[PDB]
């Protein structure tokens, strides 16, 4: 009834496991935090910041309306936020 | 079983039930043709889809003249 891998219950109660993972887990949590707090997540994914959904006097959605010029359309939208 | 004139003529075409070529045989060659056909279907699909765009291939009713 066992395939040879080490039992989970044995692993997570073991001192060595917690020696490694008390480091690896907060480091991953802190890394993810910095991904957001530095603003990197906005830039990678192209997600508008609270101040860049609309131009100041604008209430029109910058909706993509062309298939093959779509990329250019988004870029034209973005310049109109500066 | 009943023998017939036509039956006797066709006999050798139904006489090798169970005959195989040893091992893997032409399986490597088959895989090559399968791979080519896949790429060929991809091209046909992406042309129709307008994901592959070629010069002088207007995927539109306007290609009737």
């Amino acid at each position: 009834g066992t395939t040879g891998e080490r039992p989970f219950s044995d692993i997570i109660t073991s001192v060595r496991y917690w020696v490694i993972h008390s480091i690896t887990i907060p480091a991953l949590f802190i890394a993810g935090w910095l991904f957001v707090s530095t603003g990197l997540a906005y830039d990678v994914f192209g997600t508008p910041r609270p101040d860049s959904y609309y131009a100041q006097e604008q209430r029109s959605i910058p909706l993509v309306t062309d298939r093959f010029e779509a990329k250019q359309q988004v870029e034209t939208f973005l310049e109109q936020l500066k | 079983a009943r023998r017939t004139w036509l039956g006797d003529i066709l006999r050798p075409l139904n006489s090798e039930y169970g005959k195989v070529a040893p091992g893997w045989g032409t399986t490597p060659l088959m895989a090559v043709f399968m791979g080519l056909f896949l790429v060929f279907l991809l091209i046909i699909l992406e042309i129709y889809n307008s994901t592959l765009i070629l010069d002088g291939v207007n995927v539109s009713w306007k290609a009737l003249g």
């Binding site: 040879g4 910058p62 990329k71 | -």
Partner: protein, 341 residues
């Protein structure tokens, strides 16, 4: 005994997570579909395809996040990362809805892998492949709703978006535009899902309440052994109970468990057929006889005519914001409204 057989050996080793040949298709595609959804619902907007926020980064919660469909202007483009629309730009690819086709296509191939896995393990273990066969129903639902349905429409835009509230929107769209509740293929689906759930509850309860006393504890779970030959509950007492309570009962354990397979699978297959019809707007929208009478007789009113008034409200009130690419401008004076409301 070449490389192929050696590779076969390794793929089919009894380990904590069985791999198999099917795993080569299944594990990458499942993981990418799942990671695509989590990546999109955490970080990716729908501003440029829908005019909507849809990620935790933007302020949405678990109910309102979604990976939304591409803009209607994309048609049925595959929206490959390297394709003519995104042109290799990851950022633009996300902004144009590329994660939607990413998830739908990798999800499709993941579903194939899982059903191949069901076949592969069933053959290795030596059982019949009915669990694989049953999984054809989820597949028919996925492909008819997420693929066939938008393929018959103008674009992927009108497929379901991958989100809790976005699917709720999809339900209400189908009521208002397709009158989907009136469709007999949906109704057969409903009977299969509610009938399945009924069968599930009534069979579980029956077994648990016709148990044999095989131990002395008040917890009856301990008195069962997976290698015991004997039935753990009385089919005979169960049959008499239901015969006297309901009039009829099962008497054949094999038929009962086949029927449990049969009902929910068949229901889902039937609803899939109706969604194929809706791909073409081939709806069961109206009853012609009712409309002829109601047009000529303003005192004739049914729950049928009342529900169409509701659909008409749904359409006029959601279409401008739900189909922003159409630039519907409905002045207040054209909106259908009852008195006061």
């Amino acid at each position: 005994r070449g490389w192929f057989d050696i590779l076969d050996d390794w793929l089919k080793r009894d380990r904590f997570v069985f791999v198999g040949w099917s795993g080569i298709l299944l594990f990458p595609c499942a993981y990418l579909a799942l990671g695509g959804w989590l990546t999109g619902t955490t970080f990716v907007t729908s501003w440029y395809t829908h005019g909507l926020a849809s990620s935790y980064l933007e302020g949405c919660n678990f109910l309102t996040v979604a990976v939304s469909t591409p803009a209607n202007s994309m048609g049925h483009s595959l929206l490959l990362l390297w394709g003519p629309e995104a042109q290799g730009d990851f950022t633009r690819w996300c902004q144009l809805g590329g994660l939607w086709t990413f998830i739908a296509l990798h999800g499709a191939f993941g579903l194939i892998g899982f059903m191949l896995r069901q076949f592969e393990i069933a053959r290795l273990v030596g059982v019949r492949p009915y669990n694989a066969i049953a999984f054809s129903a989820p597949i028919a639902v996925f492909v008819s709703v997420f693929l066939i349905y938008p393929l018959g429409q103008s674009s992927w835009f009108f497929a379901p978006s991958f989100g809790v509230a976005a699917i709720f929107r999809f339900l209400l769209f189908f009521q208002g535009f397709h009158n989907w509740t009136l469709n007999p293929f949906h109704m057969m689906g409903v009977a299969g899902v509610l009938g399945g759930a009924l069968l599930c509850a009534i069979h579980g309860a029956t077994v648990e309440n016709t148990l044999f006393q095989d131990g002395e504890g008040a917890s009856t779970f301990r008195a069962f052994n997976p290698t015991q030959a004997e039935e753990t509950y009385s089919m005979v007492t169960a049959n008499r109970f239901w015969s006297q309570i309901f009039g009829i009962a099962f008497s054949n354990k094999r038929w009962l468990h086949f029927f449990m397979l049969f009902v929910p699978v068949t229901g889902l297959w039937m609803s899939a057929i109706g969604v194929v019809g809706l791909a073409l707007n081939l709806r069961s929208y109206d009853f012609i006889s009712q409309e002829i009478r109601a047009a000529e007789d303003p005192e004739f009113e049914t729950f049928y005519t009342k529900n169409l008034l509701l659909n008409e409200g749904i359409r006029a009130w959601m279409a401008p914001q739900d189909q922003p690419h159409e630039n519907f401008v409905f002045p207040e004076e054209v909106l259908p409204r009852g008195n006061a409301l």
